[PDB]
């Protein structure tokens, strides 16, 4: 695929830019996934262990504090950041698979979004 | 269509069954890993297939308190091969029903459906017990519904007292509660359940009993799904020691309850088990909370004495809980919060009365007939037949015929009843009361009555 | 350098959960060979074989029906009578229940103690049950004591004494029973549902009757009741288990000689006093009860109506559930799915009650006060949906479940004898399993839609509720939720 | 004596006015 | 409710009822079932038959006897003279408490 960093150098530049932008705030890419965006994310987040969600929330608070202060992380802290270490994607995919299996057999959804 | 009082036209009617059908013979196949598969062919179009494991709360000690009942609630959930949703849908596609039971020394998993769906039943049952996924959200949900199942326990005085006197009557593994405290549940999780199940669920500790299927088909479906299981050498169940004890939770208010129990032989020792069952029938009794249907125990010693000579009694009967190497025979009771001392006096006097020999032959024959009809009638049910096969092959490995039990019942004299009851009440008693215990006498005073 | 992905505690937990998920990503196909989540209509008329049910009619119209299993060690023998509270009058109401209390109270040959001692000397059981349209007395005994049980039943039916002191004692027992109508709220809710739905008809009366009637009960009342209703053409003797048809027929011919032979016939009784449905409700508001219980019902179908089978399929489609069921969120029933997924009830149960000329089809639910509005919406939505959208998978699954439950519940001599007696009273015959299965599989999605449009769509409802029910929707809202205005 | 609501709950009435 | 949090006092209370029989085994801390029945009239009946003058002592540290009597006598002299009742008798019997 063209989105493969190993095969495509444009994807390599894209991944480098995204990683650098994430590292300035100490954010993981999975931290950008908001429960309010879809009920599948909300369900996947509810299925995760507590310490992971607490770490996510702490990173979110740190990033918000940095953004409000017009500041970036110190370089010593930036060196230890792992912007693309995942904690959410596999659980999200599992929740999607379970949702699709429910839909295929004619069952009601386990959760639905509120009509605004 | 046509009204149901007129036969439907064009229906293919199967030929009728004979009015006398030769019973089938249990076939017991043992796999090299030690797993035993048993089945009996049955004329009715229903199949009952179960898996029975010699695990229970007597293996929770010391670090798995509550694991057995959690595993009971976690039955037929998500496997490594199928989601909970898919498994419920497969069970419902063939009109099946599942059930799991947890005891101190046994667990079972059963599925019931028409006999044409045997491969699906066997496949779903083994996937369930061999491959639990133990997902954390599913465990947490079953743990919330465990809190309710344990809080509503106070609403069943008989059950509450029964567990309480099991706790207060033994010291070792048998004293471990079958309904763990709330503190004991904030430690349980999926990893604990997996570690517990892997340790105890071995092939040589498991029986696949299927009532209502040909042995060839059951073997063809079950052999490829259980042989992989490794050979684990046969350990020994731990020993429990019967002691005395008192259980007392003074809640106050009204409607006291009690249970005085004594020790009896276990399922091993096959002449005295019967003496305990016939004794339980002899004392008999009833719930005293509802009526309807003669012959349920209205003319036993307990009923005819208490409920027909002393009013204001809410419950009075006898119970029994026999294990492999020990048992508990006792008498329940409700009475009134200040009538409690008189109630315990009545119960103790009744035990003493049958101990001395104050029971005539008419009552002995009555209780003997009640025992025989209770055992023969309870085998009318396909479920009970399958469960009995599984439990007996787990315990003895043979499925002893009912005829031997029937002769032991009909070899009981008054001298036997007398010597057994004398032996039973010469040992420490287990007292348990629940409700308003302030007026309830002490342990020493009740112990001095016998 | 960043930490490796097991140093920080949260990274390690993420790795563990990811590994578990990858474990679930690859299933094992040996365990995925036979079971399917898709329901298939299956024809298995081979396993459906059963022992023959012999039915013999005596010269006086008495019917003897036996199902022989000579391998059995036990048997169930009893009498099923086309009699109950529906066939009494307003001033006689309650007499059948009083007779049910009084029937084991002694005869000319036997006293109360003799009768109990005879029975429990053989280890037998004696059962008496009376309903609105059916009455049954039966004995569960060992194979040897079939003749003795038949003698016991014939004696109690034909030669009961009804002592005045026994009558007076039972009078106070029943009066206290009436004064203690509590603790069984399901039964209370259904009684009030019958009373309001079948207003001003014999079907609306309770089995117990009014207190003045039981106070007024005398010997001649009971004797007149037995003379009027316990007649040969209204009685079926049913036996199952280790019984031979011929011996039972001979014993019945010997023992059941002094019956009534009154010309009163059940079809005429139903004709001149018919039962009709009245859209209506009774709300028993009691804000000290912790849980609310209510039933909503439509007018159903009689026993012999062909639509009764479709109503059974529809009842299976709605289903039943309580909080201790493991997989309510995953079942085929959409109503059960809604209730279990949103935790809006303690229990839910669809019922299909049949009578000789009418029926009741509805839902009974137990829930907390604050769940009632959503629960009522869900119940009405899923019931009304049967008139609009029915999937082939749902009706196929319900057909399979109904066939399975009908065959699986029929285990033991007592359920078989009860099935024989009930079918002989309601259908005039024991419907063979193959015919019943053929009728069931004739219920497709279009059949369910047609039946729902006949019985549910834009139809009056009967409601009976008790407890903290101030937030239960009123009659107009339930009545409006019986149709969909988007169609 | 028994209040009217208790009597109504305890005695279903098919002759409702 | 906030009593099990102190094992010392909880055990000290429990072993009073587990060791004595009779009045001294009556809890000082009643269960949450006798509380739903306690009301002002039940407390007024309890006090009228128990708070009698012969069972009462008025003790003062830091006061002169004269004016203390001067104030106290008009407020207490009209209490009825009731006979002394015998103390309810308790029996030590020994026993065992337990709760898991
Ligand atoms: Zn009754």
Author numbering:
A (entry chain P): 7 to 122
B (entry chain A): 53 to 502
C (entry chain B): 45 to 531
D (entry chain D): 76 to 92
E (entry chain K): 203 to 302
Copy out sentences from the published article reporting this entry, exactly as the authors wrote them.
Protein complexes of the mitochondrial respiratory chain assemble into respiratory supercomplexes. Here we present the high-resolution electron cryo-microscopy structure of the Arabidopsis respiratory supercomplex consisting of complex I and a complex III dimer, with a total of 68 protein subunits and numerous bound cofactors. A complex I-ferredoxin, subunit B14.7 and P9, a newly defined subunit of plant complex I, mediate supercomplex formation. We propose that the main role of the plant supercomplex is to stabilize its components in the membrane.
In plants, complex III2 contains an active MPP domain protruding into the mitochondrial matrix. Complex III2 thus has a dual function in respiratory electron transport and in the maturation of proteins imported into mitochondria. In our structure of the Arabidopsis respiratory I + III2 supercomplex, subunit MPP-β of each complex III monomer contains a bound Zn ion as a cofactor for peptidase activity. The Zn is coordinated by two histidines (H141 and H145) and a glutamate (E221). In addition, the map indicates a potentially coordinating water molecule. This water molecule is known to be catalytically relevant as it performs a nucleophilic attack on the carbonyl carbon of the substrate peptide bond. However, the adjacent glycine-rich loop of subunit MPP-α is not well resolved. This loop is flexible and involved in substrate binding and product release. The weak cryo-EM density for this region would thus indicate an active MPP domain.
